[PDB]
Amino acid sequence: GSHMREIIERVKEKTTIPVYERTIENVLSAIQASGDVWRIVDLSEEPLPLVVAVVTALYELGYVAFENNQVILTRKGKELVEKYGIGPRADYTCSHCQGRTVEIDAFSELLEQFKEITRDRPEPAHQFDQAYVTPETTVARVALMHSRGDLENKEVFVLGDDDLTSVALMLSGLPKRIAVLDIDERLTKFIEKAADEIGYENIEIFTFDLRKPLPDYALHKFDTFITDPPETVEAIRAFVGRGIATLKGPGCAGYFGITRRESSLDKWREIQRVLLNEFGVVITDIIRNFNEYVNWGYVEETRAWRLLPIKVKPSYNWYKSYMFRIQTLEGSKGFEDEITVGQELYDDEESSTT
Amino acid sequence: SHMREIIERVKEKTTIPVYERTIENVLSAIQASGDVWRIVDLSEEPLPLVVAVVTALYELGYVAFENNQVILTRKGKELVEKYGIGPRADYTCSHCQGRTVEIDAFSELLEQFKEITRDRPEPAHQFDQAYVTPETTVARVALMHSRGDLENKEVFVLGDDDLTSVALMLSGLPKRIAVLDIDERLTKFIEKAADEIGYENIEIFTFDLRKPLPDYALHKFDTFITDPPETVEAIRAFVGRGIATLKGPGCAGYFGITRRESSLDKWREIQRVLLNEFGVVITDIIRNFNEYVNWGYVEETRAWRLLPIKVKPSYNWYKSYMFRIQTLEGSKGFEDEITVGQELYDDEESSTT
Ligand SMILES: CSC[C@H]1O[C@@H](n2cnc3c(N)ncnc32)[C@H](O)[C@@H]1O
Ligand SMILES: CSC[C@H]1O[C@@H](n2cnc3c(N)ncnc32)[C@H](O)[C@@H]1O
Ligand SMILES: NCCCCN(CCCN)CCCN
Numbered sequence: 001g002s003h004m005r006e007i008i009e010r011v012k013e014k015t016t017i018p019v020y021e022r023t024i025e026n027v028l029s030a031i032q033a034s035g036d037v038w039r040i041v042d043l044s045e046e047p048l049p050l051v052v053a054v055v056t057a058l059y060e061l062g063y064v065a066f067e068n069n070q071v072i073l074t075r076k077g078k079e080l081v082e083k084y085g086i087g088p089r090a091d092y093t094c095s096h097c098q099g100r101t102v103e104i105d106a107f108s109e110l111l112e113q114f115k116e117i118t119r120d121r122p123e124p125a126h127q128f129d130q131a132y133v134t135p136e137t138t139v140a141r142v143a144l145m146h147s148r149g150d151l152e153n154k155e156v157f158v159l160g161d162d163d164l165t166s167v168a169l170m171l172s173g174l175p176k177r178i179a180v181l182d183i184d185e186r187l188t189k190f191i192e193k194a195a196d197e198i199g200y201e202n203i204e205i206f207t208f209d210l211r212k213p214l215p216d217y218a219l220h221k222f223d224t225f226i227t228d229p230p231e232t233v234e235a236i237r238a239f240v241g242r243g244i245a246t247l248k249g250p251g252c253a254g255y256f257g258i259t260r261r262e263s264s265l266d267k268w269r270e271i272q273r274v275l276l277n278e279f280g281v282v283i284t285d286i287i288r289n290f291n292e293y294v295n296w297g298y299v300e301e302t303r304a305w306r307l308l309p310i311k312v313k314p315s316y317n318w319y320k321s322y323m324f325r326i327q328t329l330e331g332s333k334g335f336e337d338e339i340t341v342g343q344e345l346y347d348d349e350e351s352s353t354t
Numbered sequence: 355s356h357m358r359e360i361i362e363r364v365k366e367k368t369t370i371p372v373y374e375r376t377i378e379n380v381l382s383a384i385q386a387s388g389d390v391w392r393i394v395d396l397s398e399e400p401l402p403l404v405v406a407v408v409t410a411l412y413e414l415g416y417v418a419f420e421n422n423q424v425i426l427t428r429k430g431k432e433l434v435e436k437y438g439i440g441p442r443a444d445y446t447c448s449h450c451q452g453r454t455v456e457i458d459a460f461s462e463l464l465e466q467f468k469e470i471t472r473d474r475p476e477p478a479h480q481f482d483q484a485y486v487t488p489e490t491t492v493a494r495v496a497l498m499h500s501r502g503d504l505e506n507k508e509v510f511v512l513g514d515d516d517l518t519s520v521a522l523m524l525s526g527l528p529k530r531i532a533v534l535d536i537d538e539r540l541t542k543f544i545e546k547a548a549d550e551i552g553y554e555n556i557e558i559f560t561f562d563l564r565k566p567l568p569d570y571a572l573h574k575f576d577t578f579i580t581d582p583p584e585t586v587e588a589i590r591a592f593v594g595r596g597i598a599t600l601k602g603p604g605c606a607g608y609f610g611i612t613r614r615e616s617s618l619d620k621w622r623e624i625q626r627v628l629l630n631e632f633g634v635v636i637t638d639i640i641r642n643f644n645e646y647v648n649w650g651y652v653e654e655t656r657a658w659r660l661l662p663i664k665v666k667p668s669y670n671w672y673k674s675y676m677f678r679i680q681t682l683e684g685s686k687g688f689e690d691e692i693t694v695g696q697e698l699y700d701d702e703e704s705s706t707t
């Protein structure tokens with residue numbers, strides 16, 4: 001246990017994010033499958049500052065080197081993983097649905113129509129923690145929600161919409177109505193334009209900062225919400241918890257992404273406790289890597305770029321999130337308080353992509 | 355109003371929570387299938403609740419029974435049109451059956467597993483048994499391996515009608531396996547597969563999980579897998595004992611949880627157990643991962659007594675969600691004794707015994 005304990009102790013010198021032996025193993029498993037740091041973050045499913053602290057520790061202690069912009073094991077690193085029985089991570093993700101559990105064959109035309117309308121979507125804004133999902137992801141969200149009975153003739157709230165779910169939902173023709181908000185008036189303007197272009201008239205669009213309580217006319221009036229939030233626990237409240245407060249009562253649904261990239265499993269535990277104890281909802285589904293995010297232009301201006309020991313733009317869409325589905329029950333409630341935070345809505349110790 | 359009257363009527367027939375949503379799920383299901391087993395499947399409501407809802411709908415004029423089908427009457431057709439309730443669409447991935455993993459890489463393992471489990475013990479009613487399909491078993495292996503929870507790991511199997519322990523032996527992945535079951539027919543069958551495979555690093559034992567696990571077994575495994583009954587007691591006795599087997603933070607557990615025999619109210623109570631009593635995190639919840647082979651004792655169960663049409667199921671209607679959990683700082687398992695008999699298996703939401 002000494003070699004492993006020494007690494008763990010070194011990591012704890014570098015980060016206040018929890019670390020366990022299993023943290024080191026996930027990183028070491030990943031490094032054996034790939035030398036690209038982005039991909040090591042992805043495959044390890046650890047948050048990026050923790051992976052950087054672990055890779056640094058491993059370098060310091062002699063177990064890893066940086067060669068030709070790859071993170072590699074040294075001979076001593078090879079002996080370390082052989083001694084502990086850590087092999088490379090195998091992956092058997094369904095090559096058909098990309099692990100989403102839903103196929104989007106039935107929505108091909110809607111995906112083509114969605115690509116055509118969003119070809120000029122607002123570029124992601126660093127100040128609002130933006131990054132849109134692939135169009136295939138946005139269409140997969142519709143299909144998932146429809147498969148669980150949460151769109152057809154339902155009143156749908158979209159809290160934040162860089163992903164332009166509201167456009168795919170207008171294209172589907174399923175909801176009875178849609179309300180959408182966002183802080184970014186480029187997106188509220190774009191959705192308006194797209195609704196005019198579609199001839200969809202049961203949408204209400206508004207600009208809003210979710211640090212503030214939603215107005216009464218958003219409250220207790222919707223069947224389904226979807227949001228794709230920042231990952232501080234305050235943002236989870238501001239986005240997911242306000243989504244829950246839009247819901248009519250029991251038997252309504254909420255959809256949102258949560259990453260392993262910017263949230264440790266200790267933070268997931270805290271988030272789950274919020275859901276189950278503060279809001280009283282049930283989690284019906286948690287589906288790995290459901291959301292695939294398109295690499296954002298502002299990468300070189302973020303923490304992640306500053307932390308990484310090898311600084312090369314990602315070559316593939318390394319950043320993914322799990323889709324959560326929740327459902328209200330007798331007693332569930334939402335979040336209605338004001339949040340007074342500035343940039344810390346987005347930024348905590350585990351985040352790095354602003 | 356129309357909907358309120360139906361809700362009120364269901365509530366006089368069950369103590370299981372009823373919402374407008376519960377009615378919607380049933381009505382949406384009836385529009386896709388008239389097979390009562392498929393109605394239960396598609397509605398994702400527990401069976402005794404579905405029966406209550408269908409009875410209420412019958413007594414109120416919205417549903418009828420014809421040629422062994424549950425159908426909407428004309429008045430029921432009016433109802434679903436008025437409330438805008440359509441048939442349920444389903445876009446489940448046809449290549450992985452929604453499991454999120456494909457088993458192409460394990461074709462040899464699947465073949466060896468089917469060969470060796472040809473004569474597996476048939477499900478015992480008294481133990482709440484029903485084995486999953488061979489493909490499900492192999493998919494469990496694929497899932498667990500993809501999350502780094504098998505290779506050179508010490509794996510505890512709590513109950514094993516599914517014969518996961520035999521798939522694990524054939525994979526060759528674990529450092530070792532320990533398997534317990536109340537049913538000596540399964541412990542004997544596993545021991546026999548182990549001698550036939552030549553697998554040395556397996557401990558096999560007959561045990562009744564109403565009892566606390568021996569000291570010997572506590573805090574010594576990397577991964578556990580169980581597919582439990584769904585009373586909150588059984589959750590403690592199977593999953594919470596599973597957690598107690600684990601070495602500490604960073605260890606994993608796998609189990610199935612149905613919508614067939616647990617309401618979403620009981621899911622919320624189960625998840626609170628996990629998060630608050632055991633302090634584990636849930637890392638995956640994957641719909642219909644587990645497909646169960648129809649069991650022979652069906653006509654001796656509550657399900658059969660309750661159903662308004664009683665024909666044996668013609669396809670595997672019974673499925674469960676795969677949960678994966680992981681331990682963190684302060685996670686803890688269940689060590690107390692449980693003193694229920696049949697109520698281990700049996701609560702108001704259950705029907706398959
Ligand atoms: C968090 S990125 C998801 C969406 O949330 C929006 N967003 C970010 N912060 C806020 C906020 N404080 N209020 C409302 N929308 C927000 C973004 O502009 C984006 O489209
Ligand atoms: C509940 S069915 C899954 C497995 O659990 C086993 N099982 C059922 N009840 C118990 C118990 N009380 N203790 C141990 N194994 C059990 C069954 O024999 C089966 O293989
Ligand atoms: N900083 C770029 C990454 C942002 C991802 N988060 C917001 C974008 C949503 N479309 C969502 C992470 C999942 N909670």
Ligand SMILES: NCCCCN(CCCN)CCCN
Binds near residue numbers: 486583584610
């Ligand atoms: N009574 C027949 C159905 C039993 C299903 N459960 C036990 C069998 C496991 N192999 C598992 C339900 C999932 N928790």
Ligand SMILES: [Fe+3]
Binds near residue numbers: 096448450452454
């Ligand atoms: Fe698939």
